[PDB]
Design an enzyme around this catalytic site. Structure first.
Site, PDB file in Angstrom:
ATOM      1  N   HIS A  45      32.185  37.544  33.408  1.00  0.00           N
ATOM      2  CA  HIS A  45      32.289  36.789  33.903  1.00  0.00           C
ATOM      3  C   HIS A  45      32.741  36.242  31.594  1.00  0.00           C
ATOM      4  CE1 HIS A  45      30.782  34.510  37.319  1.00  0.00           C
ATOM      5  NE2 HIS A  45      31.136  35.812  37.348  1.00  0.00           N
TER       6      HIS A  45
ATOM      7  N   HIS B 119      39.321  34.440  41.085  1.00  0.00           N
ATOM      8  CA  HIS B 119      38.248  34.581  40.411  1.00  0.00           C
ATOM      9  C   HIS B 119      38.372  36.587  40.913  1.00  0.00           C
ATOM     10  CE1 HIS B 119      34.066  34.173  39.333  1.00  0.00           C
ATOM     11  NE2 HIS B 119      33.754  35.097  40.077  1.00  0.00           N
TER      12      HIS B 119
ATOM     13  N   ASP C 117      36.683  38.287  37.762  1.00  0.00           N
ATOM     14  CA  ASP C 117      36.162  39.343  37.629  1.00  0.00           C
ATOM     15  C   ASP C 117      35.899  40.858  37.525  1.00  0.00           C
ATOM     16  OD1 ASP C 117      33.820  37.898  38.360  1.00  0.00           O
ATOM     17  OD2 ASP C 117      33.733  38.641  40.628  1.00  0.00           O
TER      18      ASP C 117
ATOM     19  N   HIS D 149      31.960  44.864  42.439  1.00  0.00           N
ATOM     20  CA  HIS D 149      32.054  45.094  41.734  1.00  0.00           C
ATOM     21  C   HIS D 149      31.074  46.421  41.799  1.00  0.00           C
ATOM     22  CE1 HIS D 149      31.620  40.988  39.700  1.00  0.00           C
ATOM     23  NE2 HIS D 149      30.587  40.861  40.479  1.00  0.00           N
TER      24      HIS D 149
END
Ligand SMILES: C[C@@](O)(C(F)F)[C@H](NC(=O)c1ccc(C#CC#CC2CC2)cc1)C(=O)NO
Ligand SMILES: [Zn+2]
Length: 299
Positions: free
Chosen positions: A78, A237, A241, A264
């Site tokens: 973030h 979001h 990310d 991720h």
């Protein structure tokens, strides 16, 4: 000439780790040319510094984590997304604990604190990673791909079989030739599902999570009484990310990212494959900003 940027003044903030629940003091500091973003655990003696680069990424199950030996810095994506969207090349990120504060669950608070402090352009060319060839990684039904593109745009598609997504598609495309990172991306908060949180807390995870810093969803509804900031805040979001994970390359990207249920872990796998395939990228500068394919707002 597109110059490198650092911070004009220091930024100070306190918060709580999303997963550790620990109170953490955060300080952003200016850094010299070609420093990059460097995290620093100042609660340790001696202090441990971890450059925000793909080679230092450790575990990725919940959020992006940097590691150096037994020392870790948790939930960096973030803040790094705010770094990338604002064009910040060099900065020191000091933390009094292992996890970056979650703030409101988005990059908004970081962006405001940075822009309140102001930015400082530096007397050196800003370096970009330009995508020259298509690079894609897959695992199961998940996929992340880099595509050559004179600019920078990000698209993402998630596929949840959850009623909160009933009605429309779970896809969004952002091209920063027209999309404002600040107004349309930075405020999208992280989200968690109530069924997972009780299990996550059983494993000492999501200990700091609440409706104050995350969108909480049960089997049917968003539980936050004030609702969503974007109609498509969930996928926004995911794009937030991805922008932060992509900044682990160490330089801003000239190209296109497309994510299909990626996380991720797969994001970092894409970076590692890109870096290794040097036929697919090159470092470029722009001595004349008036002919560049991208532009940044005034510092
Ligand atoms: C969005 C994404 O799933 C993304 F990966 F898709 C991922 N969210 C998380 O990990 C996550 C976000 C919030 C909580 C929470 C809580 C609570 C509470 C009180 C009411 C009991 C747990 C996990 C992410 O943003 N990682 O960086
Ligand atoms: Zn996130």
């Amino acid at each position: 000439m597109i110059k490198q940027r650092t911070l004009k003044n220091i930024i100070r903030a306190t918060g709580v780790g999303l997963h550790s629940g620990e109170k953490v003091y955060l300080t952003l500091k200016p850094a010299p040319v070609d420093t990059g973003i460097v995290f620093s655990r100042t609660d340790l003696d001696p202090v441990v510094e971890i450059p925000a680069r793909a080679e230092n990424v450790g575990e990725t199950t919940m959020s992006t984590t940097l590691v150096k030996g037994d020392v870790k810095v948790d939930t960096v994506e973030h803040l790094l997304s705010a770094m990338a969207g604002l064009g910040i090349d060099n900065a020191y990120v000091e933390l009094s604990a292992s996890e970056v504060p979650i703030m409101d669950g988005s990059a908004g608070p970081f962006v405001f604190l940075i822009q309140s402090a102001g930015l400082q352009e530096q007397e050196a060319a800003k370096k970009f990673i330009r995508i020259k060839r298509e690079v894609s990684v897959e695992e199961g039904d998940k996929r992340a791909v880099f595509v050559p593109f004179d600019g920078f745009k990000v698209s993402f598609e998630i596929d949840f079989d959850h009623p909160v997504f009933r009605g429309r598609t779970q896809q969004a495309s952002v091209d920063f030739s027209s999309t404002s990172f600040v107004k349309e991306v930075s405020r999208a908060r992280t989200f968690g599902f109530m069924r997972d949180i009780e299990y996550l807390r059983s494993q000492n995870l999501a200990l700091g999570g609440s409706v104050e810093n995350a969108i909480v969803v049960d089997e049917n509804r968003v539980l936050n009484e004030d609702g969503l900031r974007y109609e498509d805040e969930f996928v926004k979001h995911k794009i937030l990310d991805a922008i932060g994970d992509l900044y682990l390359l160490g330089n801003s990207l000239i190209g296109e990212f497309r994510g299909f249920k990626s996380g991720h872990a797969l994001n970092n796998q894409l970076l590692r494959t890109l870096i290794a395939d040097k036929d697919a990228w090159e470092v470029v500068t722009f001595e004349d900003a008036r002919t560049a394919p991208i532009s940044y707002m005034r510092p």
